[PDB]
Amino acid sequence: MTVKLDFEECLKDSPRFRASIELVEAEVSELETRLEKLLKLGTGLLESGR
Amino acid sequence: MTVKLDFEECLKDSPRFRASIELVEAEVSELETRLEKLLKLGTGLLESGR
């Protein structure tokens, strides 16, 4: 995440900066989708356990 | 059920024998129900654990 976003060029607004803003978002979305998969499997263990 | 029985009354056709053999067949009829309930209940446990 951190190094898929050029903080350095955020006032400058280069194609570098524009490439980064588009590239960083896919790992947040990946991650969000994996977090949900564990929250549901966790309740899955909570129901069969119980 | 009776605890530790021997032959005299049994062969002299005693009413004590006769009520004592009545009461153990019923304990064995109870026993079998308790077994098939324990079987199905431990089957559901094993399925719930798996």
UniProtKB/Swiss-Prot annotation, chains A, B:
Banana-shaped homodimer laterally assembling into tetramers, the tetramers further pack helically onto the membrane. Interacts with GTP-bound ARF6. Interacts with third cytoplasmic loop of SLC2A4/GLUT4. Interacts with CLTC. Interacts with GULP1. Forms a complex with GDP-bound ARF6 and GULP1. Interacts with ITGB1; required for ITGB1 recycling. The lineage of its organism: Eukaryota, Metazoa, Chordata, Craniata, Vertebrata. It is found in: Recycling endosome membrane. It comes from the Eukaryota. Changing residue 14 to A: No effect on interaction with ITGB1. PH domain binds phospholipids including phosphatidic acid, phosphatidylinositol 3-phosphate, phosphatidylinositol 3,5-bisphosphate (PIP2) and phosphatidylinositol 3,4,5-trisphosphate (PIP3). May mediate ACAP1-binding to PIP2 or PIP3 containing membranes. Only one PH domain of one ACAP1 dimer inserts into the membrane, while the other PH domain acts primaryly to interact with adjacent ACAP1 dimers. GTPase-activating protein (GAP) for ADP ribosylation factor 6 (ARF6) required for clathrin-dependent export of proteins from recycling endosomes to trans-Golgi network and cell surface. Required for regulated export of ITGB1 from recycling endosomes to the cell surface and ITGB1-dependent cell migration. Changing residue 29 to A: No effect on interaction with ITGB1. Highest level in lung and spleen. Low level in heart, kidney, liver and pancreas. The chain holds residues 1 to 50 of 740 of the full protein. This is Arf-GAP with coiled-coil, ANK repeat and PH domain-containing protein 1. Cells overexpressing ACAP1 show an accumulation of ITGB1 in recycling endosomes and inhibition of stimulation-dependent cell migration. Cells with reduced levels of ACAP1 or AKT1 and AKT2 show inhibition of stimulation-dependent cell migration. Cells overexpressing ACAP1 and PIP5K1C show formation of tubular structures derived from endosomal membranes.
